[PDB]
Each structure stands twice: as structure tokens, then as C-alpha cells.
């Protein structure tokens, strides 16, 4: 029986590109999430919940993006632009109906993409199947 569900956090992330990589896995049931690339891969078609809570100190815009057949499918954005140098958690989430092979990831805005790096607090990216289709 399918039990795809993951949570991954940031600690020693490989930097570069607009994809936010959550390098440190906390949970990865059925291993749908790739900690090297920051991508979730759909094996079981169905409806999934995806959500993030990401720590910034300056400006951050984030989007949950997906692909089907390699075609990028841009979506909703969520921003914190307080820009005072103090911890702010930006959050977002949505249900995604996914087909087999579909990929899901978090992208930052290139002009607004400060993510806290350090040990004081955490940024998290999670997802789970709601039901198969």
C-alpha cells in the first residue's frame, strides 16, 4: 500500500540555481524526494499536499513549481519582504493532482531569495499523498 510522504530541512545545501534544495531528510517514505536536487518525484498518481516554511532575514519570494513530461509548470508565489534582518517565516502550500513521473520543487525569485543559513532555526519542505486517483 502506497505511503508517500516526506520532510526535508536545510543545513548544508548545495547552492546555485533557483531551485531550493532541502539537503537534510527527516522523512522520505518510499523515497520520493531527492535531497541532492531538491525535487519530489511522483510515483503514485493522485492528489498530494505540498507545503513549505522557509526562514529569511531579508527578502524572499518562493513558489511551488512542478513539471509534467519535462515541461515546467509555474504556480502561486509567497513572499516576505519585511527586509529588516530579523527572522521571518514565509509559508505556502497547495494540493497538486500529479501523474506518474511528475516532479515537484520549490523555486526562489532570483531578485528576492535570501534564505537563512545557520543552526539557530530551520526551513522545511514537506509533502504527502492525500489519495490516489
Amino acid at each position: 500500500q502506497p505511503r508517500p510522504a516526506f520532510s526535508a530541512i536545510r543545513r548544508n545545501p548545495p547552492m546555485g540555481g533557483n531551485v531550493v534544495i532541502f539537503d537534510t531528510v527527516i522523512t522520505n517514505q518510499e523515497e520520493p524526494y531527492q535531497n541532492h536536487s531538491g525535487r519530489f518525484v511522483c510515483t503514485v498518481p493522485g492528489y498530494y499536499y505540498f507545503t513549505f516554511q522557509v526562514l529569511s532575514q531579508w527578502e524572499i519570494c518562493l513558489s511551488i513549481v512542478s513539471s509534467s513530461r519535462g515541461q515546467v509548470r509555474r504556480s502561486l508565489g509567497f513572499c516576505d519582504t519585511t527586509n529588516k534582518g530579523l527572522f521571518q517565516v514565509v509559508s505556502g502550500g497547495m494540493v497538486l493532482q500529479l501523474q506518474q513521473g511528475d516532479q515537484v520543487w520549490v523555486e526562489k525569485d532570483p531578485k528576492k531569495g535570501h534564505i537563512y543559513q545557520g543552526s539557530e532555526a530551520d526551513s522545511v519542505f514537506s509533502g504527502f499523498l492525500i489519495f490516489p486517483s
Binding site: 492528489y47 499536499y49 507545503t51 519570494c61 513558489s63 504556480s75 502561486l76 508565489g77 509567497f78 513572499c79 516576505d80 519582504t81 519585511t82 527586509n83 521571518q88 514565509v90 509559508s91 505556502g92 502550500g93 497547495m94 494540493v95 497538486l96 493532482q97 525569485d109 528576492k112 492525500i130 489519495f131
Partner: protein, 129 residues
């Protein structure tokens, strides 16, 4: 279906009226049509335990209230001046057939996100009964 899911979004640059129900006019997914965009309300077809969560972008003060069947369940307020933040809330509720769930604002009503910051409401059936 014997399931229930929705993610609806608010696609407009004018914020809600003060002390009013928040309409989410745009659908990302809503296969059972449980959320109604013309009324702004979710209505339960399939009874059981539901998770409800929203993420709301705002550039001024914002309180979001979740209502179940005429009753305020939870309120979450974020205060901001000019710059953009995200107001978040959520709750697990065991619902009977025909029960209504919706979000509202009070005197703090701003949902004008900057370019690239959006507002989303989601709900899903977890345990049918």
C-alpha cells in the same frame, strides 16, 4: 467521488470588504465542487474529518477567521506596514453532511500581496465516516 479536496485562490488586486466573507474566485483543484466560488463557501457532501489550511498575502494588517456552520473556530492576525507577509492558519474538523466552512476578515482586511505573493485556501477529507 467518495473523496473531498480543493485548493482555491484569490485572483484580484482589490482586497475583501471589511468584516466580510473572503471569496476565492479561482480554482487550482476542486474536483467534487465542494468549494463554491460563487458563494465563497465550502459545503460538506462527504462527512468525516477534514483538514483546512490557508496562506494569505498582505501588505497591511490582516486577521483571517475560520467559520464552521456560523461559528468562529479560529482567528489569526498578522500586522505589517507596506512590506509583504504571509498570514497562515488551519484546523482539523469533523464535519456532518451539509455543514458550511468559510474564511472571513474583520476590521483588518488587507489581502493585497505584492507582485508574486498570492492567497490560497485548501481543504481535504482525511477520514470518511
Amino acid at each position: 467521488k467518495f473523496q473531498s479536496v480543493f485548493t482555491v485562490t484569490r485572483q484580484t488586486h482589490q482586497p475583501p470588504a471589511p468584516n466580510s466573507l473572503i471569496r476565492f474566485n479561482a480554482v487550482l483543484t476542486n474536483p467534487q465542487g465542494d468549494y463554491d466560488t460563487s458563494t465563497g463557501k465550502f459545503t460538506c457532501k462527504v462527512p468525516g474529518l477534514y483538514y483546512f489550511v490557508y496562506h494569505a498575502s498582505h501588505t497591511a494588517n490582516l486577521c483571517v477567521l475560520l467559520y464552521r456552520s456560523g461559528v468562529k473556530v479560529v482567528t489569526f492576525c498578522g500586522h505589517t506596514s507596506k512590506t509583504n507577509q504571509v498570514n497562515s492558519g488551519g484546523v482539523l474538523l469533523r464535519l456532518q453532511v451539509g455543514e458550511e466552512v468559510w474564511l472571513a476578515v474583520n476590521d483588518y482586511y488587507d489581502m493585497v500581496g505584492i507582485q508574486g505573493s498570492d492567497s490560497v485556501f485548501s481543504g481535504f477529507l482525511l477520514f470518511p465516516d
